[PDB]
Symmetry: D3
Subunit: 155 residues, 6 copies
Amino acid sequence: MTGAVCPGSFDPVTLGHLDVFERAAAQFDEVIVAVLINPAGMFTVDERIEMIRESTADLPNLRVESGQGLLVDFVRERGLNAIVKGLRTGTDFEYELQMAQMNKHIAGVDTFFVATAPAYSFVSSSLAKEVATYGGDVSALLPASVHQRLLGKLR
Amino acid sequence: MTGAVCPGSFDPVTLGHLDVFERAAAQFDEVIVAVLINPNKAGMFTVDERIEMIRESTADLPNLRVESGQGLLVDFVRERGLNAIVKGLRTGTDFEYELQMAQMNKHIAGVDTFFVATAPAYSFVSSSLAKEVATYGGDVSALLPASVHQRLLGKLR
Amino acid sequence: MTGAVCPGSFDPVTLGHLDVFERAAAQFDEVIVAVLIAGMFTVDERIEMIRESTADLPNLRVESGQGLLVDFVRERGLNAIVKGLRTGTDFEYELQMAQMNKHIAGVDTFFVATAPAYSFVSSSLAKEVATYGGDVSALLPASVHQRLLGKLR
Amino acid sequence: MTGAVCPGSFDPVTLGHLDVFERAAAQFDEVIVAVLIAGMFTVDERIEMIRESTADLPNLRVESGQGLLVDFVRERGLNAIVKGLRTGTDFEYELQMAQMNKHIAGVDTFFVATAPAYSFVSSSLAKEVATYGGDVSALLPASVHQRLLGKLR
Amino acid sequence: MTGAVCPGSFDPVTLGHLDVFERAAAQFDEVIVAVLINPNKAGMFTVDERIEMIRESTADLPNLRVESGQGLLVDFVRERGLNAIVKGLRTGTDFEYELQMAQMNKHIAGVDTFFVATAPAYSFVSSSLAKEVATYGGDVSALLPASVHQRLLGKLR
Amino acid sequence: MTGAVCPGSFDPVTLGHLDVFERAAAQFDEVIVAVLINPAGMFTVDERIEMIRESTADLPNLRVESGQGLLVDFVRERGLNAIVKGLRTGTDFEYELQMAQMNKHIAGVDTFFVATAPAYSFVSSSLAKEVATYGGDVSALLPASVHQRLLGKLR
Ligand SMILES: O=C(O)CCc1c[nH]c2ccccc12
Ligand SMILES: O=C(O)CCc1c[nH]c2ccccc12
Ligand SMILES: O=C(O)CCc1c[nH]c2ccccc12
Ligand SMILES: O=C(O)CCc1c[nH]c2ccccc12
């Protein structure tokens, strides 16, 4: 039985994230989305977890959990040793490569990167929030449920 | 039954490739190494030679097999009932041009591509640079499996 | 009297190229597509395919050329190039030619990011995929696609 | 009726920025420099410094703004941004914002490669160097440089 | 009498830094490690601690010395009668932003900068990532000299 | 006594190359410019060597020699173990990094990279030849003597 962890802050989850979740769930027997609790953002951890669960309702082999500290501990504690992450640019690859090599060195945990779907290559949680704050329409870039909650926080 | 295809020309296979094979074999139920052959331009090693060098250095990976092919990689993948490619990457430059091919492959056949950063120690080895260095007498013994190094010197002499 | 030149081999023109043409036509009074003159299509064929695909762009025209792009540009009274860009790698090598062109002829180059949907399309990859039976119909203008099938079949 | 907006904080404007302004003014009928509103200079100060440095550009004006750049652009009847670029790293992060801006408001972005001589100048590095006594006089408009000395001395 | 300055905050020095020091010491008659201290924000280690960790792991480099400084690097370099900086680089992204600073330093003071690719084995270590990983309990003993690892754990506990 | 080798095809030498030569000569006791003879280009090896010698007449600690085969053999045969090369882009760095790591691995030879002077960041031997072929003026980008010879070959 194979498995991977998809880590992030997901504040909020975007369609870019969801695309990665879907592709991981299609290729591994089990996927765990790991939501970081940090020393902070727009949505509480529980809010983020619920938005991810709504968006991944049709992925039966994917579950969502929170964690803190070293990601490789979160991964190994659950019997796995693979991370799956989405990538948008060469710059992304160079920073993430450092962390991937470090994670493999310290804990034997592998990282698999997947290129973003072209349609979602310019979406990030940060930019979506920023645009929405000033009234820009980001409804095509977020799951439907997320866009609903986001308008709420902003009002 | 999960599975992935690890493609390349593997002319010859390097320790960087082998590292990628091992990591894929650890994470997928089956792995197929796809040895892509250009029917127009012969490489240094024949198809038989390429496959033998890979098999000899992967004997301890019981869920990996090696097959050659040509034409579209996505056809090789789909005809085996799979839809994942695993490829090793060294640089940001690598990521950008492989990004193009992965998006195209997803578009035309729904095949996914997963990239892995190769191990630091093998980051600077490529089949082509190993060949070039060996051609002019440089020592590349530590970058190639034992199944390769002396066959390579043999080809060159 | 603003104007820009959109250069390339366009063998064949793709929807990525067409997107750039449309954006250049929307921002300059005058756009010329400059077709460089052994690929798949003849110069006349490439010109025709672009003309077919840009009929709704009244301020655009298509011409062939040879030699330095800056001479093609300057001989038509203009001094700006508009070119599409996909990657950072693209930017760094196009940057060298942009600075060279500015240096030798005072011709400016404006780059525009490809539309997300065409980030992975190029003339070369479309031909390669199509050659092995892959469906590239969503990546090429309708006219082009039929013509491409013909060259292969 | 062509036009483009050149955005930034310009704290202060550098010769790199000015080069881009001049190139945009040469290719569009109308250029607006958009100054975003705790840096070194006040908004009024930054606006003044740019106006001083662009007196020879008759089709350029300088205005301050807040919020989404695309709204600043659209509210003035335009839909193009012109921005200067130094590196491939620059292109990849600016690319994300360019595609976002096109998506949300249909505003195009044209990038231009910095002049070779200004490849290493930025507002931040000029301030940092000047703060420790380094001579940045060859990298800033004459007016700006004097004003900068004043803020430090 | 040739010479180069190797700058950094070295908070703490890593094996990647040490590799760069050794390569500079091999190619220049004298090398000065320049420990740059921000008078506004304290790092994890004091200036004394940073210098001691560097000295302890460079004892076999007789043409290298260690001095702290602040403000413009080019002033530190020129006041010692030198005009070369040697810096290690990992990525293309590293090269682009260090490129800016090297051009600026050449412009304002005529100081040259030479970059070296760090060794593959140390490519992914940085002072900041080593600190972050150690903070949350990860094992970074193989990435730092002996002079550093336990002092680091000490700071953290 | 310190030393470095500056390798290339130099077909022809540009002001970008010369800038690198000057900076190497200022920092090492001895510099050797190594001109590759290849399996080819516009200028013969002897022509290239003479153009480099004219351009570096004021660098007494720099000499010019031809070589073939493995660069690290050329370097070690002359008692040195350092290469100095100019770099223009991050892309350049990524390709050259591979070769530098390989050269250090196989022969213990170090490589030091130096960023191009801003004024010469867009010049290359290849682009200068191409531009000159079609009548473009590249005289500000090449040593004076080189531009003279180049016009000759083209006529
Ligand atoms: O955003 C990421 O890629 C990593 C998030 C992350 C770091 N440590 C973690 C521990 C538990 C869950 C998530 C994380
Ligand atoms: O592909 C490109 O961008 C350059 C094509 C090109 C070079 N010189 C040219 C002259 C005329 C028309 C096109 C060209
Ligand atoms: O620096 C930039 O390129 C963006 C500045 C910017 C964002 N929103 C803006 C609104 C008005 C004027 C300027 C801005
Ligand atoms: O162009 C380069 O950087 C390398 C040229 C080169 C490779 N092997 C060489 C051997 C002798 C002289 C030069 C060379």
